[PDB]
């Protein structure tokens, strides 16, 4: 039993605004072109071993079922772009999923591992930073002990920290600069 009171009518519009100007108004507004054909679900490799049904995500978005933002299902898409390549209505399915995930992140629906990944880029400029074994491997392989990357460049790390603060990405992940760690 789904009543009007359990629905958020502006969810589609809300997904579109989250996608404007990146990936684009025309890109994310494409969800309104969906005619629920199922080609996306049939093409989904993730859908073949789970309860995840790509078409239902778009349906929930158009109907206004907020629970889609709290779902673990939207996080099962690998961004393989098959649905994006086969949709007969030009829906930019993969991009809409990513934008829905943005709204999910804003609600606090972010896995701890994903927040950790985000924290590594914030603290060391890299999702998979160099460790003691990296230096030793690179040395034995004939490469420079430390790659010419942001991890070893304070100028570049500081540049990133300025952009992160300006984008509010630090608040999104719940990072405390004073403590140098995430909250919750």
């Amino acid at each position: 039993m789904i009543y009007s009171s359990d629905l958020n009518k502006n969810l589609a519009s809300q997904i579109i605004e989250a996608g404007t100007p990146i990936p684009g108004d025309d890109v994310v507004s494409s969800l309104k072109a969906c005619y629920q054909c199922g080609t996306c679900t049939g093409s989904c490799p993730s859908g073949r071993r789970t309860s995840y049904r790509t078409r239902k995500v778009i349906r929930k978005a158009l109907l206004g079922m907020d629970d889609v933002l709290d779902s673990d299902d939207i996080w099962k898409c690998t961004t393989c772009y098959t649905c994006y390549e086969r949709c007969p209505r030009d829906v930019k399915v993969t991009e809409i999923i990513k934008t829905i995930r943005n709204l999910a992140a804003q609600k606090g629906n972010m896995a701890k591992a994903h927040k950790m990944t985000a924290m590594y880029v914030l603290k060391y400029g890299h999702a998979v930073p160099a460790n003691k074994n990296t230096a030793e491997l690179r040395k034995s392989i004939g490469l420079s002990e430390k790659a010419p990357i942001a991890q070893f460049s304070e100028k570049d790390l500081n540049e990133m920290n300025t952009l992160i603060k300006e984008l509010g990405f630090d608040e999104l992940i719940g990072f405390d600069w004073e403590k140098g760690a995430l909250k919750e």
Binding site: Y35, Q36, C37, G38, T39, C40, T41, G42, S43, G47, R48, R53, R55, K56, E85, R86, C87, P88, R89, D90
Partner: protein, 652 residues
């Protein structure tokens, strides 16, 4: 004579008035030179509005009227008649588009939209002053029609016109008339044989005293205008004497070269000497010189001595008053939808190929069989919307007949093999006409045909068996299906026929976004084209079924018979003409006209240009290109347009 103008500002209820301050535009209009009257009214195209103009034309002795309202493309004729009824020449009337072009696109900028409306009124008034009274041109109509395309649509047009007593010429590209209908076994929703309805019509048309059928022929050139077209028909060489030919086919048994049969969609093998299908009209044979080895074996068995390899194509010149384009359509090529594997997997076929397979007179003898092993399929899957309702292949339209023919052929397969399991993969079942929903109900309740709501994602062949697997989501269950089948049928959409490009260029007609030919107006002129004396009938105008195509054929015959019955038609005088006192015969205009109207001539010992009024369609290209200004298009004179440009910034 000094211009006396009447400016009328329409509110169109609130469509204009709600955004544009119409009373303010009217006040502004009065500040322009020559404006004697200016009035604002709720609906100018209504009886009160038209009577208001007619009364004012007489009471204020006006010689120019300006209607600031909607588009001339909608009401120009209405207001032309309105002013002409009051005695004012219709070409002294000028339309100002302040609705589609202003109030409807500047709804949130009322002040600026009012300012824009004022300028558009001023631009119109500026051109109005220099407008001139023009008289339509009267031309005679040759009592003869030309129908291009011998399908059910063209045949219907030719029969009705011939039955009305009009000499009609029917040109058919292939060696036989009948079109795609001839290729179908049965036709929905009555499940009649295609032959049931089509063959008697083919028979009648071939022996009609008022219809000259030119089969295996093509229109190669069309010149002139409505009522005066000069057409060139190329009677292609069959290499057989039609008057001598019996159509027995003793020759077909002797010919040693095998050619893939186009009628059977490459699923049949014909000979170099052939008859498209057994019920073909004319029941005559043809020689494909592209594959003939000239052994002369067929000639040894032909009794009447009809085979002649020295046959040359004949160019026939004919004069027609009207032309009906009924060239039909072609089936979409699904190779592009690589996921469905057409052209890769042997057991994936198109529905048109299936029609030929299921037709008794087909290559497989009316037996539906797998092309990989020749075995009859126990499980069949129909995939709907193949090449339609799909932006990836550029066809965002519904091909109209695919839901119905898929259900029809499924009924036909069940009658021949009840044990056959048939599943139709669809999005929407479009059984929209008389008896269609009933036909749909019947397919499921009577024949047990199953329906899966889910556009398939892909088809996968088992290389060892040749069987196919259809991957699709059963949207009504929220589950993924992966059902195996012995044969997959792709319900291919309709696309314009290959020759459409050649015909478009010959007739001078346009195409809609779906690439099919464009009708004058969708709602009120469904078979006329914007090109006078040129009409459409059937699938070349858009995807549709036999009931609709036959109705269009009849409709086109009526519309095309109007000029023929009148025997006289009028043409717009917004044409080009040369001022002989200014033209020094520079010759720049001649090659600019695609209709060859401007021609150089000797007049009073000197060379000057002269437009042949009847050949001018009124584009305005050559006057625009004339360096002396001697050439002008009435109603779009350079001075008239110059004043219109000044009008945007100031009063002229």
């Amino acid at each position: 004579e000094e211009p006396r103008i009447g400016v009328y500002v329409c509110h169109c209820g609130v469509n204009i008035g709600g955004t544009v301050d119409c009373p303010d535009v009217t006040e502004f209009a009065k500040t322009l030179k020559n404006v004697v009257v200016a009035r604002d009214y709720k609906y100018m195209c209504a009886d009160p509005g038209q009577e208001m103009i007619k009364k004012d034309i007489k009471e204020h002795n006006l010689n120019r009227v300006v209607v600031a309202a909607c588009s001339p493309r909608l009401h120009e004729p209405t207001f032309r008649r309105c002013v002409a009824e009051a005695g004012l020449n219709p070409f002294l009337f000028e339309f100002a588009n302040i609705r589609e072009h202003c109030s409807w696109v500047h709804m949130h900028e009322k002040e600026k939209a009012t300012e824009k409306a004022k300028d558009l009124v001023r631009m119109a008034v500026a051109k109005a002053r220099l407008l001139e009274p023009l008289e339509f041109i009267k031309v005679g109509v040759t009592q003869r029609a030309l129908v291009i395309g011998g399908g059910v649509a063209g045949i219907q047009t030719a029969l009705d016109l011939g039955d009305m007593g009009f000499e009609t010429i029917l040109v058919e590209k292939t060696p036989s008339v009948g079109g795609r209908m001839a290729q179908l076994d049965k036709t929905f929703p009555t499940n009649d044989c295609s032959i049931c309805i089509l063959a008697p019509k083919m028979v009648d048309v071939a022996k009609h005293p008022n219809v000259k059928l030119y089969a295996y022929s093509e229109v190669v050139d069309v010149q002139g205008y409505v009522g005066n077209f000069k057409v060139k028909i190329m009677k292609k060489a069959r290499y057989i004497d039609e008057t001598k030919c019996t159509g027995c086919g003793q020759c077909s048994e002797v010919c040693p070269i095998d050619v893939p049969n186009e009628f059977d969609m490459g699923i049949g093998m014909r000979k170099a000497i052939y008859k498209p299908f057994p019920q073909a009209v004319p029941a005559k044979y043809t020689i494909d010189k592209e594959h003939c080895i000239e052994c002369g074996l067929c000639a040894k068995v032909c009794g009447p001595n009809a085979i002649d390899f020295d046959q040359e194509p004949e160019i026939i010149e004919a004069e027609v008053g009207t032309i009906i384009c009924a060239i039909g359509y072609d089936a979409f090529d699904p190779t592009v939808r690589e996921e469905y594997g057409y052209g890769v997997y042997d057991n994936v076929v198109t529905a048109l190929e299936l029609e030929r397979m299921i037709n008794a007179s087909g290559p497989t003898g009316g037996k539906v069989i797998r092309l990989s092993d020749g075995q009859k399929p126990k499980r069949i899957a129909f995939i709907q919307c193949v090449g339609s309702r799909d932006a990836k292949v550029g066809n965002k339209y519904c091909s109209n007949v695919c839901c119905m023919y898929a259900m029809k052929n499924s009924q036909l397969i069940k009658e021949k093999s009840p044990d056959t399991e048939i599943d139709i993969y669809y999005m929407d079942i479009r059984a929209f006409s008389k008896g269609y929903e009933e036909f749909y109900e019947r397919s499921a309740k009577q024949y047990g045909i199953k329906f899966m709501r889910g556009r398939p994602s892909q088809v996968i062949e088992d290389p060892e068996t040749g069987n196919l697997v259809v991957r699709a989501e059963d949207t009504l269950l929220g589950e993924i299906l992966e059902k195996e089948y012995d044969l997959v049928v792709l319900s291919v959409g309709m696309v314009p026929t290959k020759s459409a490009d050649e015909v478009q260029k010959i007739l001078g007609i346009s195409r809609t976004p779906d690439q099919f030919f464009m009708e004058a107006h969708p709602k009120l002129r469904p078979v006329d084209t914007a090109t006078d004396g040129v009409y459409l009938a059937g699938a070349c105008q858009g995807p549709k079924d036999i009931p609709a195509s036959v109705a269009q054929g009849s409709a086109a015959a009526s519309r095309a018979a109007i000029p023929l019955a009148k025997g006289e038609v009028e043409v717009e005088p917004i044409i080009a003409s040369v001022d002989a006192e200014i033209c020094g015969g520079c010759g720049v205009c001649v090659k600019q006209c695609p209709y060859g109207a401007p021609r150089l001539v000797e007049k009073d010992g000197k060379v000057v240009a002269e437009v042949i009024s009847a050949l001018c369609k009124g584009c305005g290209t050559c006057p625009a290109g004339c360096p002396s200004g001697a050439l002008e298009q009435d109603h779009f004179k350079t001075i008239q347009l110059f004043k219109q440009i000044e009008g945007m910034f100031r009063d002229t």
